[PDB]
Scaffold this active site. Structure first.
Site, PDB file in Angstrom:
ATOM      1  N   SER A 166       5.667  -6.081  -0.731  1.00 32.87           N
ATOM      2  CA  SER A 166       6.055  -4.685  -0.927  1.00 32.87           C
ATOM      3  C   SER A 166       6.161  -3.961   0.403  1.00 32.87           C
ATOM      4  O   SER A 166       6.880  -4.431   1.284  1.00 32.87           O
ATOM      5  CB  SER A 166       5.063  -3.998  -1.849  1.00 32.87           C
ATOM      6  OG  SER A 166       4.874  -4.836  -2.976  1.00 32.87           O
ATOM      7  N   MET A 167       5.440  -2.852   0.582  1.00 35.01           N
ATOM      8  CA  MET A 167       5.552  -2.128   1.847  1.00 35.01           C
ATOM      9  C   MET A 167       5.286  -3.025   3.054  1.00 35.01           C
ATOM     10  O   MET A 167       5.827  -2.784   4.147  1.00 35.01           O
ATOM     11  CB  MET A 167       4.602  -0.928   1.880  1.00 35.01           C
ATOM     12  CG  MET A 167       4.600  -0.234   3.260  1.00 35.01           C
ATOM     13  SD  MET A 167       6.078   0.785   3.646  1.00 35.01           S
ATOM     14  CE  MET A 167       6.635   1.248   2.019  1.00 35.01           C
ATOM     15  N   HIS A 223       9.611  -5.547  -4.269  1.00 38.03           N
ATOM     16  CA  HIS A 223       9.694  -4.944  -5.596  1.00 38.03           C
ATOM     17  C   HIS A 223      10.100  -3.480  -5.413  1.00 38.03           C
ATOM     18  O   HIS A 223      10.767  -3.144  -4.432  1.00 38.03           O
ATOM     19  CB  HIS A 223       8.372  -5.181  -6.357  1.00 38.03           C
ATOM     20  CG  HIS A 223       7.183  -4.417  -5.843  1.00 38.03           C
ATOM     21  ND1 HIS A 223       7.272  -3.382  -4.930  1.00 38.03           N
ATOM     22  CD2 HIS A 223       5.870  -4.521  -6.159  1.00 38.03           C
ATOM     23  CE1 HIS A 223       6.073  -2.884  -4.709  1.00 38.03           C
ATOM     24  NE2 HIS A 223       5.203  -3.562  -5.435  1.00 38.03           N
ATOM     25  N   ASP A 280       9.153  -7.918  -9.393  1.00 40.55           N
ATOM     26  CA  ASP A 280       8.594  -8.699  -8.303  1.00 40.55           C
ATOM     27  C   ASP A 280       9.479  -9.905  -8.002  1.00 40.55           C
ATOM     28  O   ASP A 280      10.046 -10.535  -8.903  1.00 40.55           O
ATOM     29  CB  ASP A 280       7.190  -9.169  -8.650  1.00 40.55           C
ATOM     30  CG  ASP A 280       6.227  -8.036  -8.799  1.00 40.55           C
ATOM     31  OD1 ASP A 280       6.533  -6.944  -8.281  1.00 40.55           O
ATOM     32  OD2 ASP A 280       5.154  -8.250  -9.428  1.00 40.55           O
ATOM     33  N   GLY A 310       0.793  -1.201   0.000  1.00 32.40           N
ATOM     34  CA  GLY A 310       0.000   0.000   0.000  1.00 32.40           C
ATOM     35  C   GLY A 310       0.834   1.263   0.000  1.00 32.40           C
ATOM     36  O   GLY A 310       1.974   1.268  -0.468  1.00 32.40           O
TER      37      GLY A 310
END
Ligand code: X3O
Lengths: 180, 180, 180, 182, 181, 180, 181, 180, 181, 176, 176
Positions: free
Chosen positions: J80-81, J105, J154, J51
């Site tokens: 991710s985050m 990523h 990714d 997000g």
């Protein structure tokens, strides 16, 4: 809604608010508040503030018949506006206890309606709204003291009344200016 | 859109089609086709096929009045169904020249309508659709040969007629089955 | 649309069709045809069939002034219905050349409008729709032979006229029943 | 939001008062049924007071209220307020005889069942038969409660029919008019 | 569309062009192309521009305006239903002496409308632009009507309707057009 | 919603908030708040924070008449903005007790409105909104100390006031910058 | 919605091509097709390209620009109403001495707009590209107007309007066009 | 637009336009044109103008295989842009006859795809787009004379080439500037 | 939300207010309400306003800003995540000496954004008004940063990002909180 | 109030899409736990696809600022985050559950507007990418260069692979 | 409250589609129950068509990880991840109700993007499909080869069929 919450504490002082469009469910809540207050004390006046643009006739009639039915006098106070069914319930108050605030405004007109279907059914339903019109005008004449014919003439189209004019029309009994 | 197109070439033989819902513009096409065929030859029959659920009453009366006004007999042929104003325009054809195909079906009933607004305007428009009902019923008596109060009762509700019952009713003259 | 197209073919016979809602682009087409027909022969009558519920007043007035400006008489024929602005353009035909069909109806009323904005703007547009109502009523009085008062009293709310009533009122000069 | 005193509707339940308001459908009817049982539980003798202001609604949903009204020991007194149409008129006339009231300006509408189906011709026949059987029984239960003959109820329900408060008394739908509290 | 060439095509070879409905680029470009064609076809005969319009996009209107002034033919304008805002402007921009109202047409005039969205800096650029557009529209109207720029300024701040007689008196058109000769 | 919430806690100190659009329901709750505080101490001042861009006039008049009617003084503090009806309710607190924060702004103009329907009814509602514009300007002139015609010119169009210019104009009495 | 004699086709016989509305691939390809065809009909006669546009897709517009330079005949450009952004570039891209404004037309110039969605790495690839196109636009603009690169840069960072006269004095167009001589 | 038909008349000069998104129906149109121009003179050149953002790969390959299959050389002309599958058909023209207009731009990359369903089916489709990626890179190496590995390295992410760069890279043979 | 009283009501006891997300009237009012309650509770103990916001309605922010300066206690602003536009303005408006970024928060400043649509005259009114707002924003900015108004003007014409160190260096905030002191 | 009860055990849940309001409710829980006791550990459970970066950074800076060690536990996924906040737990206290998966990523973004503004915003997201990379290298002990090479696309890590890579410290399987 | 009240009796309900936030609620209730009493069985009623795999796995790793056995009881249906979590219960303590049904199948998925990314995400769902099938074999006692022949397409097992398959341990018919 700020904290008994604000409306419920005002209900303890026999104050009820009618606000916005008249329909069955807000009407029922007013009816219930009146029935409740009559139980708490059938002698003391009820105060119903009316700020409304109108709405469903049968729903306003439930508040009307409850209004006349219960023992306590129902005082009406108009703030903002009282249009159509709103103006009808304002003048329905106990004689002598119907009020407008100085810049409240009132509007009266004739019943509004609509139907779709067969010609036979359209006649039935058109016949019925005319009966409703006649009933309203009678009740209107009765509460204002105008002749039936004056009510009829004056409600065929939208008629606005300032607070002084609604006193002079017999819709309300006086203006509330400042608390003594 | 099969091809100079298949309806215009059918029009060369004095054949007009009334398909689908009856409204101002499609009805106007038919008015114009009848006017035009009348210009081509006031003597000859015109053939008006009718496969229609009905539709707008004033749109249909523009066809009816045109059929009755133009010198040519307008023969009507029900293929599929002629309902409400479709049935009316089918029985409005020149007596002796109104035909149901073997399995076409006919439905008759009363005007549908409606309106919304002030009681006084509701009254005016109820009166009007009642006046229309009256005429439509009168005009149906005229063409079918039935008594006015028979028509009034047969159309208070949806009433289906097979091709045989439609002949026996007065709506059409005979069934088409096989070209001679 | 059947084929030279049908409406073009009847243009050759100096017949124009006003069908459906009066708005600019359909009104413009009608004007374009009148100017053509007059440019083809300024001495022959033009035939304007009307089946419409009314529509935009300025678009309707554009047809009206053309009808009066051009050399030919414009005979008006009502089929189905001529309501509001359709009734206006009906009654604006050449005196003596205005016709209902036996079962078309006419309805008359006062202008409709609406606006949003500042009180000052509302006033400007409200003054304007009243002027238009004034003008329309004057013209209706001129074309029917009725007093301005009669027109105004009869147009506050939708009034219907059968073809016989349309003749007795001065909207049209007679009923077309059959082609002689 | 609801005003509190207990919200408003809960306090009036203490006095054995129940509101039927708006469209009749399963959950609002099940609310009413649940209150009617609670009341009968809290006191099987005292009367229950059912305020009706409704245009009607789902028939099976109304019939759940109806059978509860007859099933329970307490008499159920019904009071028409703004309007009682269709299933609402039915449930109004179904209260304890002698204890069904119209307010002076309430109005009553009666008519015949609405509905319809979609499917194969075989199934359309089943569902048509059912609604005709339902219409037959409802007519009989209206004839019973109103006092009108079964044939009269039939004639009068083919099309919508309005009754004022007095006409509703004269018709047998309600018993008297409540005009001012004594 | 009705044939005879459709009916507008037929009246085009009599040098009648129709400005009808809202003014925007594509209907305006269509009018411009008709004027150029009518100018090619015969630069010595007048063009007849019927206007029934409520107004519309100012820059689309100004392509019509500049084309009327530019072409060698005179452009005579006739207002039939209404000519409001850009509609009135193009009406008053016809060749002097050849601008007519039919007797029951009406005219409306006012000031430019617009709107921007974005950063203060670009709001100012655009606000200043439409003010200039306003100043040119007021000038051209004064020019064509003979009112003083100041009179035009007063009467266009808010909507103002002119009947056909009033338009004749204002300078907006030259004569009313009643019955053909 | 940080909760007995924070507004209820501020209510205890006679602090009411008017936030966002004025409309019947948020207006009714301010009136109920105002009334409740009078009943508590009809002598102690009430403080109305106004951060509003305007809204429905009759809903604001319901608040306006409540401020004047109730015994206590209502002090008005504007933060963020007081636009349109919001300026009206700001200038309507007790003389001497009407404040602006430093970078809050005020905007005044005339009533906005919009009706649609029959020309006759357009006239009635056009005439009512003009009455509303006149009575608004009178009370604007009465509360600011300017003349009826100064308010009239300054309100034809949107007119913005910095907090200093609000003081200079009499809309508010002074500016709060730091707490004493 | 069109008149026949078809009207733009008839105006095509006078070597007149119209650029109305928003610039996009398909309306652009229509204009390249008319330019190519008109060349084949006669490579010596000029081409007239009337421009009334708010602008639009750059590449689609660049497809008209390169067609304009590529073809043998001179492309005379005429602004009516407005030539904004890509519309203005195509205006000033006409043959030298044959780009005109009509007196009340207007012109607006700015910088490329675009946008991208994706990964940082891909955001850089596209951001660079729109910066490179911006550099090529300012150059071709500096060329056709006779202004310096730096001046075109400063004047296009934000929306900039030019009246017909200011466009002549800026080099966008060679002269105004008031009346057919 | 402009039926005088402009695209039809250019086809007679053996000019075909590929504009906009590559999909089966417009590609089928280009194929149908190339077929037709072969059948007209299988020896004269054909001229494919390309202004295109790319599109469906199999739709594009139908154009590609038609270009090689037909006897005529297909000269390609980028105009505006040729991205993704636009770039591919651009470089797929006949050697020595692939051109860029001076300010056109090219963009190249690897295929995009999207699938949903069962893991087993995802594998079948992911295998397939990798196969298609390998073939496209192969063909692209064969028309640019660059290595497979150079193509692979450059198409992993979006790569923009101006007209000169596209010549330096071998995508087109030169830049059209002015007609000779 | 989790109860503990809910998590934010519990941090209010520690005089901590959160300014999260878009600045608009009702979230602004809840912030003002909170500050009025915290001053009343103790007019001397500092108030901690955490800020993570992309901006929002200027009048709504300005209600927060003026409440911050009116009330007696000092307001300490802690940036976390991001303070953009009006959020940046409110963070730098905390008590001088007590404005912080966390180490990886980022700040963004730019000029006002707005939009009007209407008559040219009212466009003039609202464009003037937004220029008036832009000036005072720049002035209160320079006051709280110490930068010259000219520097503020030049650096807020377009979006301008600042890291935590950059915001320290600029006067936006006074220091960075890295680990607990 | 099941999360409230679990909050009493110093357990905070990071579920679903990272954005401002849930991040802020994450920060408010960490500050409250520090005040209740600054020496005890906090346990942040992560099950997130990621997000908004600035929203995650508000959680990251709070984890570093507060005195308590914030242990991070990956369950389901941290993508991710979500995986940045996983790798930012107190060293030695970052855990994967056996069947969680991790995805790293590079920042995703998007602007629209003038070219000058495009360059402004693109420059910034490249700045964010560098600092994301810097901190990723910092907490995993990989070199900035390795992180730059691994995050361009990714990249899925299983719990064991997340331990080898440095993203987490070990795998919780059963409670001792 | 009715569900809070059954939670006091150590009962959690897993009802409907498996997604992050309902799965977080389940995980929180498990950690709560484990804390309340790490020695007492937890009962997990499953009525579900399946849902997001990573959300389901966070439940699955919690059930394994926490101290108490998690007894699972299928009611209505347990399909896909619903079925997976049902066979995930403590051996000996997984139930079907007599007329519940169970569906197993392979993982569902979907990506969109560049080929190189498609390969990355395609590779990962195949890894996920391997682990899934491996865990099922484990819990059911079936061979790996059998699990994937049976799950390549949708397979329905009645309650007796699922006992025999090793998906659950016995059927519940009447309380004793
Ligand atoms: C309204 C006013 C009482 C007010 O809001 N107090 C808030 C504190 S409530 C409180 C009080 C006691 C105990 C507990 C509590 C609490 F909170 F725990 F429940 P006030 O202090 C004010 C005005 C404006 C602003 C700002 F910043 F928005 F502009 C801010 N505050 C005030 C001051 C002066 C005047 C004068 F002199 F002009 F008449 C009038 N009003």
């Amino acid at each position: 809604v700020p904290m008994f919450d604000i409306y419920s504490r005002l209900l303890k002082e026999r104050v009820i608010f009618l606000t916005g469009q008249v329909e069955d469910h807000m009407a029922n809540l007013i009816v219930a508040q009146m029935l409740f207050l009559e139980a708490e004390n059938p002698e003391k006046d009820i105060y119903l503030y009316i700020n409304s643009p109108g709405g469903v006739i049968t729903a306003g009639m439930s508040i009307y018949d409850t209004m006349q039915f219960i023992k306590p006098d129902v005082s009406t106070i108009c703030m903002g506006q009282a249009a159509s069914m709103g103006a009808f319930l304002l003048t329905a108050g106990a004689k002598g206890k119907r009020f407008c605030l100085p810049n409240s405004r009132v509007m009266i007109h004739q019943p509004l309606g609509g139907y779709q279907g067969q010609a036979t059914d359209i006649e039935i339903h058109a016949r019925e709204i005319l009966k409703v019109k006649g009933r309203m005008n009678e009740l209107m004449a009765l509460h204002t003291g105008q002749s039936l014919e004056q009510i009829e003439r004056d409600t065929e189209r939208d008629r606005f009344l300032s607070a002084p004019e609604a006193v002079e029309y017999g819709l309300v009994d006086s203006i509330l200016t400042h608390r003594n």
